[PDB]
Amino acid sequence: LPEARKLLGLAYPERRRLAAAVGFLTMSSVISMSAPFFLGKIIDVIYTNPTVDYSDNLTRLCLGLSAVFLCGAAANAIRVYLMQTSGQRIVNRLRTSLFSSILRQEVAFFDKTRTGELINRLSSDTALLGRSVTENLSDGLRAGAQASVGISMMFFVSPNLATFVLSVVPPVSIIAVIYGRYLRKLTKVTQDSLAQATQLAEERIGNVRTVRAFGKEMTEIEKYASKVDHVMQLARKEAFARAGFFGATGLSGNLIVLSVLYKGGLLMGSAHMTVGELSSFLMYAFWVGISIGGLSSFYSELMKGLGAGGRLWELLEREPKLPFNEGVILNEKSFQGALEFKNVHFAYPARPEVPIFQDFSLSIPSGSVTALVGPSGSGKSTVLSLLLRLYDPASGTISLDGHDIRQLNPVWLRSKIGTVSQEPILFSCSIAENIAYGADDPSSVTAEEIQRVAEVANAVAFIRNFPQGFNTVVGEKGVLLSGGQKQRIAIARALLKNPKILLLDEATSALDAENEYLVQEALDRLMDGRTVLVIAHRLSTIKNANMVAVLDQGKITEYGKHEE
Amino acid sequence: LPEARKLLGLAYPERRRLAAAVGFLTMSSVISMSAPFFLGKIIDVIYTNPTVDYSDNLTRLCLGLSAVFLCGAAANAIRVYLMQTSGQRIVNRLRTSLFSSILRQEVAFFDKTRTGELINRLSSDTALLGRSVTENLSDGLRAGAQASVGISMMFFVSPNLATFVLSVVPPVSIIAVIYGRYLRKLTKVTQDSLAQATQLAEERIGNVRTVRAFGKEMTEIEKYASKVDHVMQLARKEAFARAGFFGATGLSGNLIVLSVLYKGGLLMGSAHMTVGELSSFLMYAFWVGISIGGLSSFYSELMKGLGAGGRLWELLEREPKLPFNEGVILNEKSFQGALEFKNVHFAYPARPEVPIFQDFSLSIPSGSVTALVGPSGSGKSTVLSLLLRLYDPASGTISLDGHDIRQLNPVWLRSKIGTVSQEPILFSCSIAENIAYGADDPSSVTAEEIQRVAEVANAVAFIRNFPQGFNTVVGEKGVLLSGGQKQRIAIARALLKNPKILLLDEATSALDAENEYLVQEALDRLMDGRTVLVIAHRLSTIKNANMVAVLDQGKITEYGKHEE
Ligand SMILES: CCCCCCCCCCCCO[C@@H]1O[C@H](CO)[C@@H](O[C@H]2O[C@H](CO)[C@@H](O)[C@H](O)[C@H]2O)[C@H](O)[C@H]1O
Ligand SMILES: CCCCCCCCCCCCO[C@@H]1O[C@H](CO)[C@@H](O[C@H]2O[C@H](CO)[C@@H](O)[C@H](O)[C@H]2O)[C@H](O)[C@H]1O
Ligand SMILES: CCCCCCCCCCCCO[C@@H]1O[C@H](CO)[C@@H](O[C@H]2O[C@H](CO)[C@@H](O)[C@H](O)[C@H]2O)[C@H](O)[C@H]1O
Ligand SMILES: CCCCCCCCCCCCO[C@@H]1O[C@H](CO)[C@@H](O[C@H]2O[C@H](CO)[C@@H](O)[C@H](O)[C@H]2O)[C@H](O)[C@H]1O
Ligand SMILES: Nc1ncnc2c1ncn2[C@@H]1O[C@H](COP(=O)(O)OP(=O)(O)CP(=O)(O)O)[C@@H](O)[C@H]1O
Numbered sequence A, B: 001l002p003e004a005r006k007l008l009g010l011a012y013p014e015r016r017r018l019a020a021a022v023g024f025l026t027m028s029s030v031i032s033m034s035a036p037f038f039l040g041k042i043i044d045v046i047y048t049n050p051t052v053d054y055s056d057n058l059t060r061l062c063l064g065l066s067a068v069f070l071c072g073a074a075a076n077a078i079r080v081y082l083m084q085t086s087g088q089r090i091v092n093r094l095r096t097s098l099f100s101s102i103l104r105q106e107v108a109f110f111d112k113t114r115t116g117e118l119i120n121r122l123s124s125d126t127a128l129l130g131r132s133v134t135e136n137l138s139d140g141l142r143a144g145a146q147a148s149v150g151i152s153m154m155f156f157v158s159p160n161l162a163t164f165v166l167s168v169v170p171p172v173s174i175i176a177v178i179y180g181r182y183l184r185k186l187t188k189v190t191q192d193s194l195a196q197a198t199q200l201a202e203e204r205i206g207n208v209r210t211v212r213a214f215g216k217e218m219t220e221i222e223k224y225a226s227k228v229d230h231v232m233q234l235a236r237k238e239a240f241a242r243a244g245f246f247g248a249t250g251l252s253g254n255l256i257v258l259s260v261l262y263k264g265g266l267l268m269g270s271a272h273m274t275v276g277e278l279s280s281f282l283m284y285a286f287w288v289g290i291s292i293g294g295l296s297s298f299y300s301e302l303m304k305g306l307g308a309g310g311r312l313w314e315l316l317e318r319e320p321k322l323p324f325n326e327g328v329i330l331n332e333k334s335f336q337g338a339l340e341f342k343n344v345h346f347a348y349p350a351r352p353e354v355p356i357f358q359d360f361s362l363s364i365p366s367g368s369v370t371a372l373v374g375p376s377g378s379g380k381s382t383v384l385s386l387l388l389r390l391y392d393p394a395s396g397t398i399s400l401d402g403h404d405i406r407q408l409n410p411v412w413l414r415s416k417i418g419t420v421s422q423e424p425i426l427f428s429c430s431i432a433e434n435i436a437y438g439a440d441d442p443s444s445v446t447a448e449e450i451q452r453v454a455e456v457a458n459a460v461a462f463i464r465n466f467p468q469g470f471n472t473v474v475g476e477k478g479v480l481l482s483g484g485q486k487q488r489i490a491i492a493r494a495l496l497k498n499p500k501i502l503l504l505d506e507a508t509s510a511l512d513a514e515n516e517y518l519v520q521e522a523l524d525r526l527m528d529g530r531t532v533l534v535i536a537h538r539l540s541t542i543k544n545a546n547m548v549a550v551l552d553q554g555k556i557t558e559y560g561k562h563e564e
């Protein structure tokens, strides 16, 4: 009931479309149900009168049936459209709402949740939920109403035969459900064993570097073959039980129809029924069987949509553990760009056992370049993550001009901070759209503004040297760029943003004489007149930095000029 | 025909099972097809003789039909089992063969191919192909034979009515195919637009760090909402065309049956047919419709299995671009463990534009420790990749005791080389199974051997301090370990292998006083009496190394003792 209230409200804006479509589905289903009754009376009329010409009755009946069919087709067309479009609007409202919630979440959420699971929830579960309260709801509503009218019409036509069907079907069905529960058991065994075999396979393929290195390729191939040979053994046993079941199911099914043909046949011989009346009964009994299969599927789909519903309302009602757009903004006079770390203790959420900062304190003063130095994996890159407030420190404070960055609006805080990554990220957009991304409104930036920053960041040469120029679609689903190129576009983006604070994570790892010069020249133009925090790789940038801070074992172990 | 020859040979070892099951499917399908004919004659017998008692005929017919049904059920059970088990053996042979080919491939293959695609090919495509040459083949073979017997029986019963059905169904079907081609168009448009919207979504979620950093969360949420609002617009248009189609399809379907009921009804009135003979004809016409739907699905599944077949024979016949187990092995006297790089030029296959080594030459002499030193991303780790021959140099040679490592058996070459990674890889096995992995036969290693190396690698304390001890299932699908723990298990593995050459990639990045000591102590015991190549992070290991080699800009820029 608390879950059903959510599904009802979901379908609520579409209440009038779904009420009209269900109204058309009511008409069609019920008018359709009268056919076995009228076919029975026609069968008996023919039987009674083999000497009567029925051509004019047939012509009128078939002419009249055409108009009923033309209406039913026009009713069905409308019903389908109203149903499909109702579901589309529901799936649209679910997509916009789920995406909105996901982006609002803290970084830590994405550290613990896989993108594939979020995309599967935004693609498949939004699809399930939409068609569960629409197409499936109508599917089960028709099948439910058709078994209702069907069973009623079986008792109407013959209470003896209907009571007989009713005494035979449930016992047989119950025994078949039990065999079905045994079959499900042998199936999960086989599919659990197959999951293990696939996990073994997946793991070894994923880490073929370690398998090679130990000469265990032939060992794993044989280990896997042994596992899937055993699955075959379980599948053969599961195949014997499925053969027995299908054979028993078919026999029961046939013998139940043979029972009703026999019992009905005897009742006909005793003048308890006509051939028409029997034809009529068997058509309804067949219609009931389909309606039970219809209610059966509807349940399996309603369960699926409920499982999907739980996964969606999970993310739809998740409150980000870090503020999204709340807090204060600083005055023009009050904002100077001075930053301070005071006794920062931090360990990443995925590995909370590994401390990155253990009493980290660093004062980056306004307008001065500060070069961060330390061994590999010391936690230099994590400094930019904490400044952008992607995470909050466990202990201590990060302050901007004496204000705890926690009290400020994070979106605003990041509007003041520009960043140049080790390996920058470019979306599958144009080069110009990627540069425009720096601006507080990438729509307000003129072609001339994008061309200016591209010249200053030394990117205009390679961009213009591309077939489509600034309209060259980059990213993953586009034209692949070098690190030096990606970094210069990251500089162009930062130039456009015009931030008071700049955070550079140098990429001296991947650089050649041609790139490394135009990048160092662009980075010099960029650094000019900003509070800079540079993670220094090149000894040249350490040398002319106002201060050097050494990060060892999660703390600032040394602090002074390159000489001192 | 060249593809059909591969599918035939695939089913060939199961030829006798599939021939028996098809023989049972032939019996059942054809004996089943006679029912509308005999139902027609029974209908006419009743019609002609309303005053005759048929109780004893009915009882005998229903008793006889029970024995026919009991046989048919026993025939079907056998058929299903033979079919299911034939497919299981085919799917087993495909699994073992595909996995064998994958593991044999060079590392570069895995650098360019995603694990998900290889697992989907080993799970879903092995399943498709198996049931395509079995269950689907029988499905289409029955439906193909049933339309054959069905159409034949329609002309037998009434050539006028069958010729009539034949003149009406194809035109209507042809027009419906054209509308179906138009419907497919509007569907691909909507689903292409939805793919774009999902790619946008997937990309932004995947890189929420860059979206946050530019305060573009609200911008992307609105960008996505705009895209999926437009999909709704396309889906509404696609929904109108689907409504029109379904309505037209239903009308055509109903009016075709109304035509045959009318035409057949008129022929009855003219004494061209009996009611039984008409009942008979309509049952066959209904059976043909199902058989055409059966051949239709069979085609869609045969195409799917052929698409799967192309993807499997791709990897099944791929020749690894690097030898798997071929080459020479060196004599006990000839193998000393001396290594040499001479003018090595190498760029990784995924990024062939980025050179890692540009005339790299380094002589690591037998029994001496050589410490590799260089800036981050200089290509220090790539040295171990080339020594293990995961890749071959583009230019130059890597030699073992004067022998080009290319002329040697790579499995044997790696049996001489032990390795300790930055972040070691532990499979979802027991700690003991993971340690045993070092041995040339992890089955031949006694509990005492695994316990010895665990003591020496300083791992026995934390292992024994685990609830299940050496039987503690580690890896991803198991108990998560620290880097220091994973590294000490990597030392235990190397100790057991007992290699003449050892390649260490130090992890000074993640280390605390307790771990860093027991690891440095275990690594000292391990280094003892081996040709060592250590990528040095700790200044302590550089100091007591026989030689230090500096890697700058893809070459050995400096070479000498720590002091010199
Ligand atoms: C899948 C599991 C197996 C399914 C179970 C199959 C069981 C076999 C079914 C037998 C059906 C015949 O059932 C038989 O029907 C007739 C007609 O109603 C009954 O006959 C009796 O009642 C009818 C009225 O109803 C009278 O006209 C008749 O004179 C009288 O003998 C029999 O008493 C009954 O036994
Ligand atoms: C597996 C095969 C199963 C076949 C189906 C069962 C058939 C069993 C044989 C019984 C059929 C003969 O039984 C006979 O049917 C006719 C047709 O309804 C009945 O006839 C009755 O209804 C017809 C209308 O249909 C009237 O025209 C007629 O005046 C009236 O007597 C007879 O009173 C009955 O004796
Ligand atoms: C979905 C698209 C729409 C479907 C198309 C529907 C078209 C309408 C079908 C009309 C069917 C009636 O077709 C009609 O059959 C009777 C009986 O065979 C024919 O009747 C003629 O031949 C029969 C013998 O076959 C003689 O007994 C009869 O005396 C003579 O008039 C008519 O000449 C024919 O017109
Ligand atoms: C949408 C509704 C469609 C309903 C189906 C079509 C019915 C159209 C009306 C025609 C039926 C009456 O037509 C009549 O059928 C009976 C039964 O076969 C025929 O009767 C014939 O076959 C029966 C056996 O079935 C014999 O017992 C009889 O000796 C013989 O004459 C008549 O010769 C024919 O005139
Ligand atoms: N989201 C995350 N969750 C868990 N661990 C993470 C993480 N992001 C980074 N790490 C780990 O934190 C440690 C320090 O990260 P960081 O990137 O700050 O250091 P670094 O910049 O010193 C490495 P490099 O020398 O390559 O630039 C590393 O061991 C890294 O694997």
Ligand SMILES: Nc1ncnc2c1ncn2[C@@H]1O[C@H](COP(=O)(O)OP(=O)(O)CP(=O)(O)O)[C@@H](O)[C@H]1O
Pocket (backbone or CB within 6 Å): A376, A509, A510, B111, B348, B349, B350, B351, B356, B375, B376, B377, B378, B379, B380, B381, B382, B383
């Ligand atoms: N399979 C692969 N395909 C493409 N590029 C790869 C790669 N494996 C590594 N690289 C890249 O090659 C470069 C050098 O790699 P490598 O791991 O050898 O250096 P390193 O050991 O100096 C880094 P660290 O200081 O973190 O240990 C890096 O820029 C890395 O991203």
Ligand SMILES: [Mg+2]
Pocket (backbone or CB within 6 Å): A380, A381, A422, A505, A535
């Ligand atoms: Mg870094």
Ligand SMILES: [Mg+2]
Pocket (backbone or CB within 6 Å): B380, B381, B422, B505, B535
């Ligand atoms: Mg490395």
